[PDB]
Amino acid sequence: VKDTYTDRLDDWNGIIAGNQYYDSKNDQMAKLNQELEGKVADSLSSISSQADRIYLWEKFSNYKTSANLTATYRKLEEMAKQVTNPSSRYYQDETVVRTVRDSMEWMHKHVYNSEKSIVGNWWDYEIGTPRAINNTLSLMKEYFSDEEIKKYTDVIEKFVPDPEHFRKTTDNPFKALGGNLVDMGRVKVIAGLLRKDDQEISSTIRSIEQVFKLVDQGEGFYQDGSYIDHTNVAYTGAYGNVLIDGLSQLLPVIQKTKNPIDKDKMQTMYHWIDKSFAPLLVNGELMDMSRGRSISRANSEGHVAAVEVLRGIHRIADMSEGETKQRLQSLVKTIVQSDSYYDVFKNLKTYKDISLMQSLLSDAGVASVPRTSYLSAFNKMDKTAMYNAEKGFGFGLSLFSSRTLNYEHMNKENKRGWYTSDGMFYLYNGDLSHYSDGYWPTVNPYKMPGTTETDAKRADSDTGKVLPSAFVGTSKLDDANATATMDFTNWNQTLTAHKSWFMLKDKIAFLGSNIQNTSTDTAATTIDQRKLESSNPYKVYVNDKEASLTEQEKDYPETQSVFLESSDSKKNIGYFFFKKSSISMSKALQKGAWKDINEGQSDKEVENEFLTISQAHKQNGDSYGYMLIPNVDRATFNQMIKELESSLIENNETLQSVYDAKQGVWGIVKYDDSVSTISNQFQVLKRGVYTIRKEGDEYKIAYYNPETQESAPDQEVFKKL
Numbered sequence: 264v265k266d267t268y269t270d271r272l273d274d275w276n277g278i279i280a281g282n283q284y285y286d287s288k289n290d291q292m293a294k295l296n297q298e299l300e301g302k303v304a305d306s307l308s309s310i311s312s313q314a315d316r317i318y319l320w321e322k323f324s325n326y327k328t329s330a331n332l333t334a335t336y337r338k339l340e341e342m343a344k345q346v347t348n349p350s351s352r353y354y355q356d357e358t359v360v361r362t363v364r365d366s367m368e369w370m371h372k373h374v375y376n377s378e379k380s381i382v383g384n385w386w387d388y389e390i391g392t393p394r395a396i397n398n399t400l401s402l403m404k405e406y407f408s409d410e411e412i413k414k415y416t417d418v419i420e421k422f423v424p425d426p427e428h429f430r431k432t433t434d435n436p437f438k439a440l441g442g443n444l445v446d447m448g449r450v451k452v453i454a455g456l457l458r459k460d461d462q463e464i465s466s467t468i469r470s471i472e473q474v475f476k477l478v479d480q481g482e483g484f485y486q487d488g489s490y491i492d493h494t495n496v497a498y499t500g501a502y503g504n505v506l507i508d509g510l511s512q513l514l515p516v517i518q519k520t521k522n523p524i525d526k527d528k529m530q531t532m533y534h535w536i537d538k539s540f541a542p543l544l545v546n547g548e549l550m551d552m553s554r555g556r557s558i559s560r561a562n563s564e565g566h567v568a569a570v571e572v573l574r575g576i577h578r579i580a581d582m583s584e585g586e587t588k589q590r591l592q593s594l595v596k597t598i599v600q601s602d603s604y605y606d607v608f609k610n611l612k613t614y615k616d617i618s619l620m621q622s623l624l625s626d627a628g629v630a631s632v633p634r635t636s637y638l639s640a641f642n643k644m645d646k647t648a649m650y651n652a653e654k655g656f657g658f659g660l661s662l663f664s665s666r667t668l669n670y671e672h673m674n675k676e677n678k679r680g681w682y683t684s685d686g687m688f689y690l691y692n693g694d695l696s697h698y699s700d701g702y703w704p705t706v707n708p709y710k711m712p713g714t715t716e717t718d719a720k721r722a723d724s725d726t727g728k729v730l731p732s733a734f735v736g737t738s739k740l741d742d743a744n745a746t747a748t749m750d751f752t753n754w755n756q757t758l759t760a761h762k763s764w765f766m767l768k769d770k771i772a773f774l775g776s777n778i779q780n781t782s783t784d785t786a787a788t789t790i791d792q793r794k795l796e797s798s799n800p801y802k803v804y805v806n807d808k809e810a811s812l813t814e815q816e817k818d819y820p821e822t823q824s825v826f827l828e829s830s831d832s833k834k835n836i837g838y839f840f841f842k843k844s845s846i847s848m849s850k851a852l853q854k855g856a857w858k859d860i861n862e863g864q865s866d867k868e869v870e871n872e873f874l875t876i877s878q879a880h881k882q883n884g885d886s887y888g889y890m891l892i893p894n895v896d897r898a899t900f901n902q903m904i905k906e907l908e909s910s911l912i913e914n915n916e917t918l919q920s921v922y923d924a925k926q927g928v929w930g931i932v933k934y935d936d937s938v939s940t941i942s943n944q945f946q947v948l949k950r951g952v953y954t955i956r957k958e959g960d961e962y963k964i965a966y967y968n969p970e971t972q973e974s975a976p977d978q979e980v981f982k983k984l
């Protein structure tokens with residue numbers, strides 16, 4: 264009742280709503296206010312106003328489905344925001360004030376109280392709903408009595424009494440870490456501020472600290488930047504988001520309590536941003552390979568997901584000072600400005616976040632220079648991110664091994680992500696909307712780019728698996744060159760292939776050998792499946808001769824090269840086959856719906872055109888070998904393949920190697936411990952992945968053993984000839 268807790272709750276309110284920063288003459292703020300007003304109007308004109316109703320809102324009447332619980336409270340929160348906004352048409356409106364208060368009671372008496380038990384997802388009973396309830400009582404604290412707040416938060420205590428574990432009410436609770444651990448703070452630090460429970464605050468804060476540590480196993484952030492969740496899933500771009508997004512919201516309040524958090528523990532926060540998040544952001548897009556099952560959500564495509572991270576970073580920068588505040592500010596500014604496809608404000612949902620972004624972008628003192636080149640090998644989550652600032656393209660390598668799950672199909676989401684980690688690659692170029700605009704529900708799940716597979720049908724009911732082999736990993740020499748491999752075996756053990764990738768600054772070689780098939784199904788590797796633009800059509804050249812592609816698969820034997828020519832060179836893609844190969848191509852309209860891959864999504868039909876290139880393997884001991892060259896014009900491409908006409912050093916069952924003469928760099932993958940002499944210059948001696956650079960008479964070496972996850976002394980793996 265107007266004490267020190269209300270002081271902290273006031274700060275929270277300024278963070279989650281920020282009504283005190285509202286300015287009607289502010290274009291962006293007025294827009295968001297227009298959105299909230301419309302939400303509250305729709306909730307008010309559709310709410311049940313009859314005697315003894317059986318649902319507050321019919322669209323969320325089935326209180327057997329966990330979602331209907333927090334979606335219902337989310338509506339009362341939106342009302343709490345407008346009722347306290349002086350510029351809203353619902354400011355201090357008696358019907359809104361009474362509706363909220365009245366609605367808290369009904370839900371409490373008949374749907375969510377202490378004498379209840381989890382039904383559906385636990386997430387809604389412990390995180391979603393409790394969060395929406397906390398925010399509502401905080402925003403409207405001047406309309407509720409302390410006793411009413413106590414009474415209304417008691418149920419949160421029942422379901423979430425332990426700030427260390429979740430599902431404590433059920434039979435199989437679990438330890439809270441990472442994203443979920445941060446959501447625990449949003450539930451118990453606020454509920455504790457509302458209930459004026461000092462014990463609850465200190466113990467949840469004390470428990471939040473756990474997040475500030477790095478891990479060498481299990482869930483959490485690794486020192487190499489990888490972030491794992493759900494036991495063994497690469498998840499920086501989804502659960503990592505929740506972590507930073509939520510922690511950046513809480514910190515300001517936490518720090519003003521009697522239990523602040525050590526300035527050094529937050530030193531690691533800057534590490535996550537620089538080592539984990541930043542590399543996954545390309546032209547404002549958050550690489551899908553790190554978003555797990557969220558890739559199947561229509562309203563959370565790459566550019567939109569990226570904004571959850573950016574606003575968290577922004578909030579953190581604002582907490583810092585001096586250089587740190589400056590550098591984080593420029594990181595956010597340059598990324599936001601490099602995004603010509605998505606409007607960042609479309610995902611800044613509070614007035615403080617909008618105000619912050621505006622200050623940032625209009626401040627000439629904050630630098631905004633193009634990000635420089637970089638290559639991150641997240642070996643702890645079997646992902647690899649590469650970015651070339653000079654030519655301007657990004658590249659992502661999605662793998663998995665015995666240490667990680669290939670794909671997460673859970674809660675009925677991402678039903679067909681079967682091959683998204685079977686050596687699938689991502690190419691981020693001039694077309695910033697490639698993986699957006701319905702790419703996921705329209706891409707053929709059976710031909711993910713870069714993957715070798717049989718045409719056997721797959722079931723939506725299937726779920727993730729780990730790889731039998733641990734020989735999966737990337738050897739990084741510098742920020743422009745690296746080598747990767749995957750001792751691949753498919754889902755039903757009927758196909759194998761030694762797949763290797765050679766990232767050489769401005770191109771990537773794809774080598775595959777030892778391809779074997781014991782099934783009757785047909786086997787082939789998808790060189791590419793690119794989503795086309797009706798605006799920037801491609802002129803296709805095979806062997807440098809114009810070709811006309813059809814929906815029908817056209818076969819091109821003796822193919823030495825394929826070139827996709829756009830009017831914008833930053834969208835061109837070339838494929839040089841080290842040895843004339845038999846490939847087939849087709850261009851076709853592919854239709855689908857989001858519901859097809861996520862039960863909770865829309866059934867509305869979506870469609871996009873895709874250009875598919877693939878190579879069939881009709882024999883045991885088959886292989887493939889091609890160089891991918893993006894962002895160069897036709898004439899340069901033709902020039903480059905002339906130089907690379909001898910870049911293939913080897914590609915068989917025990918050794919794969921490509922040589923970049925212009926750079927003096929070698930990419931090498933050895934599957935056995937025999938001695939391999941390379942280019943009559945040196946010898947490599949151990950199973951593993953190498954990336955070597957000759958500098959004068961000296962050699963720079965980068966060796967990595969994927970199985971043991973260790974490097975090694977040079978003399979054990981390399982011998983100069």
Ligand SMILES: O=C1O[C@H]([C@H](O)CO)C(O)=C1O
Pocket residue numbers: 384386391674
């Ligand atoms: O962690 C989760 O995120 C979603 C959610 O629907 C977003 O509110 C959900 O389904 C989970 O179990």
